[PDB]
Design an enzyme around this catalytic site. Structure first.
Site, mmCIF file in Angstrom:
data_model
loop_
_atom_site.group_PDB
_atom_site.id
_atom_site.type_symbol
_atom_site.label_atom_id
_atom_site.label_comp_id
_atom_site.label_asym_id
_atom_site.label_seq_id
_atom_site.Cartn_x
_atom_site.Cartn_y
_atom_site.Cartn_z
ATOM 1 N N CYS A 277 114.153 19.084 21.331
ATOM 2 C CA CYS A 277 114.718 19.103 19.910
ATOM 3 C C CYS A 277 114.303 20.432 18.987
ATOM 4 O O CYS A 277 115.089 21.059 18.260
ATOM 5 C CB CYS A 277 114.580 18.029 19.196
ATOM 6 S SG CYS A 277 112.623 17.386 19.217
ATOM 7 N N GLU B 206 124.845 30.833 23.841
ATOM 8 C CA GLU B 206 125.017 29.447 24.341
ATOM 9 C C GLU B 206 125.740 29.574 25.729
ATOM 10 O O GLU B 206 125.745 29.149 26.645
ATOM 11 C CB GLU B 206 125.288 28.425 23.596
ATOM 12 C CG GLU B 206 125.559 27.093 24.077
ATOM 13 C CD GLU B 206 124.240 26.399 23.936
ATOM 14 O OE1 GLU B 206 123.561 26.222 24.945
ATOM 15 O OE2 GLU B 206 124.030 25.812 22.670
ATOM 16 N N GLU C 75 113.629 25.048 33.558
ATOM 17 C CA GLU C 75 113.905 26.070 34.997
ATOM 18 C C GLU C 75 112.996 27.469 34.510
ATOM 19 O O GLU C 75 112.533 27.473 33.533
ATOM 20 C CB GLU C 75 115.228 26.238 35.155
ATOM 21 C CG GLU C 75 115.952 25.169 36.000
ATOM 22 C CD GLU C 75 115.334 24.647 37.114
ATOM 23 O OE1 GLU C 75 116.091 24.499 38.103
ATOM 24 O OE2 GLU C 75 114.249 24.206 37.161
ATOM 25 N N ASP D 63 107.071 30.082 6.887
ATOM 26 C CA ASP D 63 106.835 28.942 6.712
ATOM 27 C C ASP D 63 106.989 28.459 5.166
ATOM 28 O O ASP D 63 106.381 29.214 4.278
ATOM 29 C CB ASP D 63 105.334 28.527 7.249
ATOM 30 C CG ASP D 63 105.400 28.754 8.687
ATOM 31 O OD1 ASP D 63 106.277 28.375 9.307
ATOM 32 O OD2 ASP D 63 104.147 28.965 9.248
ATOM 33 N N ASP E 225 109.429 12.507 11.506
ATOM 34 C CA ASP E 225 109.261 11.190 12.204
ATOM 35 C C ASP E 225 110.403 10.584 12.152
ATOM 36 O O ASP E 225 110.805 9.774 11.698
ATOM 37 C CB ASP E 225 108.149 10.295 11.506
ATOM 38 C CG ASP E 225 107.755 9.048 11.929
ATOM 39 O OD1 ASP E 225 108.064 9.039 13.411
ATOM 40 O OD2 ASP E 225 107.362 8.203 11.444
ATOM 41 N N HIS F 166 111.657 5.471 15.265
ATOM 42 C CA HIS F 166 111.984 4.373 14.576
ATOM 43 C C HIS F 166 113.282 3.767 15.115
ATOM 44 O O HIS F 166 114.154 4.488 15.075
ATOM 45 C CB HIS F 166 111.730 4.142 13.116
ATOM 46 C CG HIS F 166 110.252 4.619 12.544
ATOM 47 N ND1 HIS F 166 110.047 5.789 12.112
ATOM 48 C CD2 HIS F 166 109.253 3.472 12.633
ATOM 49 C CE1 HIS F 166 108.527 5.790 12.109
ATOM 50 N NE2 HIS F 166 107.888 4.482 12.068
ATOM 51 N N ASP G 222 102.696 12.668 10.796
ATOM 52 C CA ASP G 222 102.955 12.754 12.069
ATOM 53 C C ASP G 222 104.254 12.733 12.678
ATOM 54 O O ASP G 222 105.033 11.697 12.529
ATOM 55 C CB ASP G 222 102.223 11.677 12.932
ATOM 56 C CG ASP G 222 100.640 11.487 12.773
ATOM 57 O OD1 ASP G 222 100.317 12.427 12.158
ATOM 58 O OD2 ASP G 222 100.062 10.509 13.174
ATOM 59 N N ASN H 168 121.372 16.644 13.381
ATOM 60 C CA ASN H 168 120.412 16.243 14.617
ATOM 61 C C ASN H 168 121.268 16.846 15.959
ATOM 62 O O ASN H 168 122.236 17.444 15.827
ATOM 63 C CB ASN H 168 120.574 14.773 14.660
ATOM 64 C CG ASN H 168 119.372 14.120 15.716
ATOM 65 O OD1 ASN H 168 118.516 14.949 16.286
ATOM 66 N ND2 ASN H 168 119.389 12.707 15.758
#
Length: 220
Positions: free
Chosen positions: A25, A86, A96, A114, A137, A140, A160, A187
């Site tokens: 990700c 891509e 690989e 940052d 996070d 869930h 976290d 996402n």
């Protein structure tokens, strides 16, 4: 800052991709941010190779399907002098050996920035720069089954994080609880997940799921 921002309407954002069953990700988050900054500079939207990052950015600290960081990806592109498209270096969802070919490089960067660990700073970045790489996070069940509305998980950690995603905007909508603000997040679980692959993450709710804790973008 504006009340609502959507970089998709300005042409900065490629369609939703699918990382498969590979812990890559971070690579999809990094390519999303670099796609936005390259478009900002050149006016051309070109999908970038996550496989290039998975296979090749180990020296910057990334670990392929076992995890990595968007900043390490931006460092790779700078150090390597390019990143393949891509189309030329397609995604295989497995690590690989590096097959980078500079003839097919379509992107570059000169480092990264940052963002301070505050949602107010993240909002200013989203409002003025373009899509921003962030970590959240995502661990869930409620996130897996997300379908619509503003995602809020009481048990989400702000410290976290386990999942890199892309903030493409922010906005609001009226809700029962009057917690109406959201980050618009792309996402990399395919378009069948969430809202066409997108989620509206709670905004200005104590840095929900840590969205402002590891935010950055490449300098182009």
């Amino acid at each position: 800052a504006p009340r609502s921002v959507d970089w998709r309407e300005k042409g900065y954002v490629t369609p939703v991709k699918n990382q498969g069953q590979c812990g890559s990700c971070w690579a999809f988050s990094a390519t999303g941010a670099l796609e936005g900054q390259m478009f900002r500079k050149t006016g051309r939207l070109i999908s970038l190779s996550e496989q290039n990052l998975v296979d090749c950015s180990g020296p910057q600290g990334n670990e392929g399907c076992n995890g990595g960081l968007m900043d390490y990806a931006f460092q790779y592109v700078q150090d390597n002098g390019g990143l393949d498209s891509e189309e030329s270096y397609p995604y295989e969802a497995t690590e690989e050996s590096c097959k980078y070919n500079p003839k097919y490089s379509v992107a570059n960067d000169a480092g990264f920035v940052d963002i301070p660990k505050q949602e107010k700073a993240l909002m200013k970045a989203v409002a003025t720069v373009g899509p921003i790489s962030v970590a959240i996070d995502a661990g869930h069940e409620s996130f897996l089954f997300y379908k619509e509305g503003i995602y809020f998980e009481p048990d989400c950690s702000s410290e976290d994080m386990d999942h890199g995603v892309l903030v493409v905007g922010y906005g609001f909508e009226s809700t029962e609880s009057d917690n109406n603000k959201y980050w618009l997040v792309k996402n990399s679980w395919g378009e069948e997940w969430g809202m066409g692959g997108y989620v509206k993450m709670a905004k200005d709710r104590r840095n929900h799921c840590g969205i402002a804790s590891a935010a950055s973008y490449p300098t182009v």
